[PDB]
Enzyme design. Structure first.
Site, mmCIF file in Angstrom:
data_model
loop_
_atom_site.group_PDB
_atom_site.id
_atom_site.type_symbol
_atom_site.label_atom_id
_atom_site.label_comp_id
_atom_site.label_asym_id
_atom_site.label_seq_id
_atom_site.Cartn_x
_atom_site.Cartn_y
_atom_site.Cartn_z
ATOM 1 N N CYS A 94 0.785 -1.233 0.000
ATOM 2 C CA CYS A 94 0.000 0.000 0.000
ATOM 3 C C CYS A 94 0.823 1.292 0.000
ATOM 4 O O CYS A 94 1.604 1.547 0.918
ATOM 5 C CB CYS A 94 -0.965 -0.007 1.193
ATOM 6 S SG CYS A 94 -2.061 1.433 1.233
ATOM 7 N N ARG B 40 -0.164 4.578 2.856
ATOM 8 C CA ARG B 40 -0.014 4.416 4.292
ATOM 9 C C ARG B 40 0.311 5.648 5.129
ATOM 10 O O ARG B 40 0.323 5.565 6.351
ATOM 11 C CB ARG B 40 0.997 3.310 4.579
ATOM 12 C CG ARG B 40 0.420 1.929 4.326
ATOM 13 C CD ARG B 40 1.445 0.848 4.591
ATOM 14 N NE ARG B 40 2.420 0.738 3.509
ATOM 15 C CZ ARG B 40 3.582 0.110 3.634
ATOM 16 N NH1 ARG B 40 3.899 -0.442 4.798
ATOM 17 N NH2 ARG B 40 4.407 0.003 2.600
ATOM 18 N N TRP C 185 -9.283 5.807 -0.871
ATOM 19 C CA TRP C 185 -9.638 6.508 -2.092
ATOM 20 C C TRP C 185 -8.657 6.071 -3.173
ATOM 21 O O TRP C 185 -7.590 5.547 -2.876
ATOM 22 C CB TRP C 185 -9.648 8.035 -1.899
ATOM 23 C CG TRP C 185 -8.426 8.635 -1.291
ATOM 24 C CD1 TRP C 185 -7.251 8.928 -1.922
ATOM 25 C CD2 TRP C 185 -8.267 9.049 0.068
ATOM 26 N NE1 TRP C 185 -6.370 9.506 -1.040
ATOM 27 C CE2 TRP C 185 -6.968 9.592 0.191
ATOM 28 C CE3 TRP C 185 -9.100 9.020 1.198
ATOM 29 C CZ2 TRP C 185 -6.477 10.101 1.399
ATOM 30 C CZ3 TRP C 185 -8.616 9.527 2.398
ATOM 31 C CH2 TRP C 185 -7.313 10.062 2.489
ATOM 32 N N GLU D 218 -4.609 3.484 -10.848
ATOM 33 C CA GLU D 218 -5.365 2.251 -10.634
ATOM 34 C C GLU D 218 -6.495 2.182 -11.667
ATOM 35 O O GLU D 218 -6.766 1.129 -12.253
ATOM 36 C CB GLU D 218 -5.964 2.221 -9.221
ATOM 37 C CG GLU D 218 -4.938 2.183 -8.084
ATOM 38 C CD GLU D 218 -5.603 2.111 -6.710
ATOM 39 O OE1 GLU D 218 -5.800 3.175 -6.075
ATOM 40 O OE2 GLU D 218 -5.949 0.988 -6.275
HETATM 41 C C1 HEM Z 1 -6.434 6.397 1.588
HETATM 42 C C2 HEM Z 1 -6.047 6.051 0.330
HETATM 43 C C3 HEM Z 1 -5.420 4.867 -0.116
HETATM 44 C C4 HEM Z 1 -4.671 4.814 -1.255
HETATM 45 C C5 HEM Z 1 -4.378 6.016 -2.185
HETATM 46 C C6 HEM Z 1 -4.145 3.462 -1.375
HETATM 47 C C7 HEM Z 1 -3.444 2.975 -2.493
HETATM 48 C C8 HEM Z 1 -3.067 1.635 -2.713
HETATM 49 C C9 HEM Z 1 -2.541 1.107 -3.958
HETATM 50 C C10 HEM Z 1 -2.301 1.883 -5.257
HETATM 51 C C11 HEM Z 1 -2.405 -0.246 -3.810
HETATM 52 C C12 HEM Z 1 -2.050 -1.271 -4.900
HETATM 53 C C13 HEM Z 1 -3.358 -1.481 -5.648
HETATM 54 C C14 HEM Z 1 -3.231 -2.428 -6.818
HETATM 55 O O1 HEM Z 1 -2.238 -2.313 -7.572
HETATM 56 O O2 HEM Z 1 -4.137 -3.278 -6.989
HETATM 57 C C15 HEM Z 1 -2.843 -0.556 -2.470
HETATM 58 C C16 HEM Z 1 -2.834 -1.840 -1.915
HETATM 59 C C17 HEM Z 1 -3.283 -2.157 -0.611
HETATM 60 N N1 HEM Z 1 -3.807 -1.228 0.309
HETATM 61 FE FE1 HEM Z 1 -4.030 0.773 0.074
HETATM 62 N N2 HEM Z 1 -4.535 2.681 -0.288
HETATM 63 C C18 HEM Z 1 -5.380 3.525 0.466
HETATM 64 C C19 HEM Z 1 -6.149 3.080 1.580
HETATM 65 C C20 HEM Z 1 -6.072 1.798 2.167
HETATM 66 C C21 HEM Z 1 -6.705 1.410 3.421
HETATM 67 C C22 HEM Z 1 -7.584 2.304 4.287
HETATM 68 C C23 HEM Z 1 -6.279 0.136 3.732
HETATM 69 C C24 HEM Z 1 -6.564 -0.663 4.872
HETATM 70 C C25 HEM Z 1 -7.204 -0.311 6.023
HETATM 71 C C26 HEM Z 1 -5.385 -0.249 2.654
HETATM 72 C C27 HEM Z 1 -4.795 -1.519 2.552
HETATM 73 C C28 HEM Z 1 -4.088 -1.996 1.451
HETATM 74 C C29 HEM Z 1 -3.723 -3.383 1.260
HETATM 75 C C30 HEM Z 1 -3.868 -4.545 2.274
HETATM 76 C C31 HEM Z 1 -3.246 -3.478 -0.021
HETATM 77 C C32 HEM Z 1 -2.798 -4.751 -0.755
HETATM 78 C C33 HEM Z 1 -3.967 -5.418 -1.468
HETATM 79 C C34 HEM Z 1 -3.533 -6.593 -2.320
HETATM 80 O O3 HEM Z 1 -2.590 -7.306 -1.907
HETATM 81 O O4 HEM Z 1 -4.142 -6.811 -3.393
HETATM 82 N N3 HEM Z 1 -5.247 0.768 1.697
HETATM 83 N N4 HEM Z 1 -3.269 0.607 -1.796
HETATM 84 N N1 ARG Z 2 -6.646 3.083 -3.565
HETATM 85 C C1 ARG Z 2 -7.081 1.924 -3.106
HETATM 86 N N2 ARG Z 2 -7.627 1.878 -1.892
HETATM 87 N N3 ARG Z 2 -6.959 0.828 -3.873
HETATM 88 C C2 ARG Z 2 -7.382 -0.534 -3.534
HETATM 89 C C3 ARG Z 2 -7.228 -1.503 -4.712
HETATM 90 C C4 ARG Z 2 -8.271 -1.208 -5.798
HETATM 91 C C5 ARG Z 2 -7.962 -1.781 -7.204
HETATM 92 N N4 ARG Z 2 -6.579 -1.417 -7.637
HETATM 93 C C6 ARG Z 2 -8.957 -1.241 -8.242
HETATM 94 O O1 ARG Z 2 -8.515 -0.797 -9.314
HETATM 95 O O2 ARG Z 2 -10.167 -1.268 -7.986
#
Ligand code: HEM
Ligand code: ARG
Ligand code: HEM
Ligand code: ARG
Ligand code: CAC
Ligand code: CAC
Ligand code: ZN
Lengths: 416, 414
Positions: B118, B121, B290, B295
C-alpha cells in the site's frame, strides 16, 4: 503439485513451473524472513579482490561443473573426451593452482553468462554474441587496440552487432587487467563552483580520475571521456578514443521542431566495461561487452533521472506544460516526447535501437524458448519492466523467478 | 543481518532493523527470489475447523497485547498484566479469545500500517473503524456494508474506513463477502468468448446470476453483493444506486473523450482479504480509502485483460498504431490518466495522482524509519504502472517482510 516455483502470467492466465532454479549454486540476498530483491548492489555476487589463491577445492568443483555444462551442451556428456578434459583440468589446477579454457569453452561460457543475466531484457539475442578472444593481450596499449577493434566491429556504421572482448583472466598474486571506466563510451561530469554538475553526474568520479591522470578536460555537456586502461601491476594508462570511432546521434523530435535546438545527443554503443565475467571459477576482470540500446535507457533513465541529466523540467517548459502541479502529468508528457525523440533520431541516423514495447515482446518469446530449453529463465522483474509505461508492456503481467546461475557477469570493486 | 537500504536519487542510506520483528515467512529463499509473485503458493490461510495450537495462538496473542499497551504508553502497567491473564485464561479454557474494541481499532490501523503493497499508508493513523462483530446474519452484514459505504463516500469527500465482521471460529463456517470489492462492474461472457464489461469479474458475475440476480447487459453494470453467514448459502443483495457514487469520464481538451461513455466508481473497497490480529482471523473486514489515479486510468482501463481501451483511445487520437515505435500506447495511456484526474476533480471526488502519492509515501518511509526503524514495502506494487522512474519511489530500495497485524489473502469461499 510440482515442488518448484509456480509462475503465473496474469494477462494470459497461463502457468509454468521453474525447475531451472534448482541448478543455482549461488545464494542471492533473500531469505524467508525478508525479500531484498529491490537492492541494486546486494553484497552477494560481489567479487571482492581475493589476492590469495582460490581454494583449489572450491575452484575445482566450480571447474568440473562448468566442464560438465560444456560437454552437455555439445551432447557428449560422459564421453571419453569429457572425462579426459575433467582430468586435464584437475591436473592443471593440481600443479599450477589454476587452469585455462579452450577457445570453444570460452565462447560457450561468455554466451551462457549473457543468457544467465537476470537483468537483461535483450537476451533473445544471446546465441548471436561475437566473442573476441583477447587472452594474449600483454599491455595497456594492446588493450586499447583490442577495444578500438571491438568498438569498430560492434558499431558497424550504425548496424550494431553484439560483442564481447575477453582479456587475460585473474592470476594468483598477479595484478588484474582492468578497465577503470564503467562503459567504453561515457560523457564527462564536471563538478561546478556552486556544487552543481555540467554533463553526466553519474561520471564525476571517473572524470576526476582521468584528470588526476593527465587528461586535459573540456567544459561541455557531452564530452566523451578518455579510457583509463590497466595492465597487471601497472598504473593505469590514458587513451583518447579517436572521434571517428565514437558514433553519436544528435536528438530531434518528429514534430516538435524546437527539440533539436536543445542540443541533446547520445552515443550509439552501450558497452559495459567494469563487470567481471566468471566462468568455471575463472575470473575475467576485463571483458567489455556490448549490444544496442533499448530506448528508455537513454530517453527515460539517462536523460530524465533526477540524478542524471534531469531534463524533464526543461522539456516540459518548452512544451508549455504546468510544472507547478503534479496532476497536470507534465513529467509523464515530457518523458513520452523525449523517448519518442530518441527513437526518431536513431531511426533517422540509421543506428540500431529497440523501443520498450518491441523489446519486452521479444523478451516474452525468449521466456517461452527458455521454458522449453531449460525449464525456466532467471529474471529480475524490477529491471526487466521498463521505466515508463510499465503495465503497457507484456512483462509487467509476467511473474518472474530471480536466481544466480554460472557462468555469470558480476559486479566487482573499483580498482582505485 | 540488518539490510543496508540506499536511495539512488539522493545517495542516502538507512538500515532496516524492523524486519527482525518479522515472525512470518515470505516466499523467498537464498536460492531464488519470488518477490514478483502476486499470490502465496503456501502462505495461504488454511481452514479453521480445528482450534490452532494453544501455545502458537497464545504467543501471537501476548505479542499483540504487548504491542497494544506499548502504543498507549502503559506497558508493565497493572491493566497490561491483567489483560494478559484474561487472554491466557480464555485460550486455556476455550482455545480462542476475544479482542476489546480499543484493541481491534489499534489492530486494524496497524494492519494497514504493515501492508507492504500500500502506497497510501501515510494516512494509516486516520482510519474509521466500525465494529460489526455484533452481526449474526447476511442481512445484517448488508446493513453494515451500506452504512460503511455511506460514511466512506461522504458525498465525494472520501474517508478511510473498515468494518470488521465476526472472527473465524473453530469448526464453524466463516462470515464472508464473496465479492472482491464492494463495488465492481459485471463481466458478461458472450458468443465468441469476448466479454462485455470487466473481464476480471466474469466468475463473480456468473455466481450472482446463478443465485437469482437478473443480469443487465452494459459495460458498467454495478454488481449485487453475495454475503454469506456461517454455514449458509450466500445471499444476494442489490446496493441502492444512490449509495454508489460514480464519475463519468471526460477529457480537459479532447471533446470526443466523453463520447467513449467511460466511467468508474468512486469507492475502492477491497472485501475479500483476511484481517489477522493477535492470532485471531477476521474473514470479512472490508476496507476502503480513495483511488490513486493510475489504478483506474492505467490498470483498470488499460490492462490487456481488463477494459483494454488503449487502441480505441489511440484511434480517436488518430495516432500511428502501425508500429510500436510511435509510442501510441504511451501517449494514449497518459491522456486516459489525465481524463481520470480531470473527471474526479470536476466531480469533486477524492483522488490522488501517482506523483503526489509517491511523494507522500517517501515522507511515510522517513516517518517510519524514525518511529520503528524501517518500513516493509513491496517495490513492484509501490512503484506506479506508468512513469515508474519519474517518481521518487523508483529510486528507493525497499525491504519486504511480513509484520502482524496483517491483511492477507484467503481462499475463495466457493
Ligand atoms: C487512503 C487512500 C489509499 C490509497 C491512495 C491506497 C493505495 C493503494 C494502492 C495503489 C495499492 C495497490 C493497488 C493495486 O495495484 O491493486 C494498495 C494496496 C493495498 N492497500 Fe491501500 N490505499 C489507500 C487506503 C487503504 C486502506 C484504508 C487500507 C486498509 C485499512 C489499505 C490496505 C491496502 C492493502 C492490504 C493493499 C494490498 C492489497 C492486495 O494485496 O491486493 N489501503 N493501496
Ligand atoms: N486506492 C485503493 N484503496 N486501492 C485498492 C485496490 C483497488 C484496485 N486497484 C482497483 O482498481 O479497484
Ligand atoms: C542486444 C541488445 C541488448 C539489449 C537491448 C539489452 C538491454 C539491457 C537492458 C535494458 C538492461 C538494463 C539496463 C539498466 O537498467 O541499466 C540490460 C542489463 C544487462 N545486460 Fe543487456 N542488453 C543487450 C545486450 C547485452 C549483451 C551483449 C550482454 C552481455 C554479453 C548483456 C549483459 C547484460 C548484463 C550483465 C546486464 C546487467 C548489468 C547490471 O547489473 O548493471 N546485454 N541489458
Ligand atoms: C546494452 N542496451 N544496455 C546496457 C546498460 C547501459 C546503461 N543502462 C545506459 O543507459 O548506458
Ligand atoms: C522550446 As524551449 C522553450
Ligand atoms: C471518440 As473517437 C471514436
Ligand atoms: Zn526476494
Amino acid at each position: 503439485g510440482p515442488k518448484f516455483p509456480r509462475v503465473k502470467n496474469w494477462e494470459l492466465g497461463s502457468i509454468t513451473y521453474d525447475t531451472l532454479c534448482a541448478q543455482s549454486q549461488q545464494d542471492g540476498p533473500c531469505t524467508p524472513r525478508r525479500c531484498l530483491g529491490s537492492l541494486v548492489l546486494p553484497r552477494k555476487l560481489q567479487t571482492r579482490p581475493s589476492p590469495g589463491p582460490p581454494p583449489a577445492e572450491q575452484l575445482l568443483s566450480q571447474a568440473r561443473d562448468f566442464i560438465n555444462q560444456y560437454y552437455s551442451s555439445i551432447k557428449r556428456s560422459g564421453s571419453q573426451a569429457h572425462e579426459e578434459r575433467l582430468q586435464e583440468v584437475e591436473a592443471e589446477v593440481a600443479s599450477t593452482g589454476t587452469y585455462h579454457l579452450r577457445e570453444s569453452e570460452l565462447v560457450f561460457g561468455a554466451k551462457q553468462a549473457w543468457r544467465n543475466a537476470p537483468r537483461c531484457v535483450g537476451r533473445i539475442q544471446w546465441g548471436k554474441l561475437q566473442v573476441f578472444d583477447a587472452r594474449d593481450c600483454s599491455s595497456a596499449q594492446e588493450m586499447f587496440t583490442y577495444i578500438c577493434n571491438h568498438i569498430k566491429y560492434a558499431t558497424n556504421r550504425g548496424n550494431l552487432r553484439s560483442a564481447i572482448t575477453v582479456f587475460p583472466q585473474r592470476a594468483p598474486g598477479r595484478g588484474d587487467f582492468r578497465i577503470w571506466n564503467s562503459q567504453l563510451v561515457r560523457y564527462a561530469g564536471y563538478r561546478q563552483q556552486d556544487g552543481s554538475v555540467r554533463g553526466d553526474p553519474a561520471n564525476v568520479e571517473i572524470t576526476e580520475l582521468c584528470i588526476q591522470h593527465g587528461w586535459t578536460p573540456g567544459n561541455g555537456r557531452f564530452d566523451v571521456l578518455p579510457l583509463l586502461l590497466q595492465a597487471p601491476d601497472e598504473a593505469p594508462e590514458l587513451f583518447v578514443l579517436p572521434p571517428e570511432l565514437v558514433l553519436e546521434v544528435p536528438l530531434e523530435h518528429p514534430t516538435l521542431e524546437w527539440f533539436a535546438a536543445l542540443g541533446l545527443r547520445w552515443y550509439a554503443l552501450p558497452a559495459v566495461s567494469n563487470m567481471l565475467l566468471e566462468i568455471g571459477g575463472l575470473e575475467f576482470s576485463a571483458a567489455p561487452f556490448s549490444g544496442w540500446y533499448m530506448s528508455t535507457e537513454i530517453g527515460t533513465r539517462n536523460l530524465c533521472d533526477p540524478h542524471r541529466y534531469n531534463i524533464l523540467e526543461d522539456v516540459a517548459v518548452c512544451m508549455d506544460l504546468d510544472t507547478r502541479t503534479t496532476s497536470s502529468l507534465w513529467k509523464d508528457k515530457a518523458a513520452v516526447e523525449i523517448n519518442l525523440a530518441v527513437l526518431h533520431s536513431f531511426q533517422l541516423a540509421k543506428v540500431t535501437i529497440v523501443d520498450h514495447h518491441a523489446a519486452t515482446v521479444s523478451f516474452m518469446k525468449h521466456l517461452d524458448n527458455e521454458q522449453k530449453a531449460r525449464g525456466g529463465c532467471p529474471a529480475d522483474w524490477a529491471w526487466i519492466v521498463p521505466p515508463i509505461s510499465g503495465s503497457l508492456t507484456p512483462v509487467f503481467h509476467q511473474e518472474m523467478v530471480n536466481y544466480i546461475l554460472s557462468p555469470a557477469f558480476r559486479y566487482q570493486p573499483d580498482p582505485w
